[PDB]
Design a protein around this ligand. Structure first.
Ligand SMILES: *[C@@H]1O[C@H](CO)[C@@H](O[C@@H]2O[C@H](CO)[C@@H](O)[C@H](O)[C@H]2NC(C)=O)[C@H](O)[C@H]1NC(C)=O
Ligand SMILES: *[C@@H]1O[C@H](CO)[C@@H](O[C@@H]2O[C@H](CO)[C@@H](O)[C@H](O)[C@H]2NC(C)=O)[C@H](O)[C@H]1NC(C)=O
Ligand SMILES: *[C@@H]1O[C@H](CO)[C@@H](O[C@@H]2O[C@H](CO)[C@@H](O)[C@H](O)[C@H]2NC(C)=O)[C@H](O)[C@H]1NC(C)=O
Ligand SMILES: *[C@@H]1O[C@H](CO)[C@@H](O)[C@H](O)[C@H]1NC(C)=O
Ligand SMILES: *[C@@H]1O[C@H](CO)[C@@H](O)[C@H](O)[C@H]1NC(C)=O
Lengths: 21, 49, 21
């Protein structure tokens, strides 16, 4: 729906902790 | 072309769709409400003019 | 203390990931 959206990664700071556990 | 910025100082250009999204934040409506309805909002504006 | 408070669940985005780990 958004006119002119662009593609990128968005960082998720829970994941590396839970992954490292 | 530049929002309120030409008032405070230099004219800092910004896309008008994103200027209007700032205007929406000012009235306490989240900016996604602009971007998800931009075509309707533009049509309402053009009709009101 | 709060007048007119109502009972409801409040969700938590950490909880299912911790549960998955
Ligand atoms: C952003 O990424 C999506 C995919 O995640 C792109 O969507 C694809 O677009 C092509 C056409 O260029 C289609 O043939 C594919 O089927 C689409 N894939 C999906 C999963 O929808 C999208 O084009 C990207 N945005 C830009 C501006 O390139
Ligand atoms: C919000 O109100 C607008 C009218 O200001 C609605 O837009 C109209 O939608 C109908 C279809 O249901 C179209 O035929 C009209 O042309 C639209 N008007 C304009 C100016 O574009 C809109 O549907 C309403 N949205 C909700 C969620 O109620
Ligand atoms: C909301 O839930 C609480 C418990 O979490 C309920 O509190 C109890 O209410 C009774 C009276 O109906 C008291 O006798 C108990 O001492 C209360 N317990 C606690 C732990 O406070 C409350 O009744 C519920 N309210 C609604 C509208 O469902
Ligand atoms: C900006 O305008 C160009 C045409 O000058 C168009 O191709 C492009 O899609 C537009 N981008 C956005 C984000 O509106
Ligand atoms: C609304 O009125 C009822 C009485 O009918 C009362 O029990 C309730 O606590 C009131 N709630 C609030 C938020 O004032």
């Amino acid at each position: 729906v958004v006119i002119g959206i662009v593609n990128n990664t968005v960082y998720d700071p829970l994941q590396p902790e839970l992954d490292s556990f | 072309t530049s929002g309120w910025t030409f008032g405070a100082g230099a004219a800092l250009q910004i896309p008008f769709a994103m200027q209007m999204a700032y205007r929406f934040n000012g009235i306490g409506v989240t900016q996604n409400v602009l971007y998800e309805n931009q075509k309707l909002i533009a049509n309402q504006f053009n009709s009101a003019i």
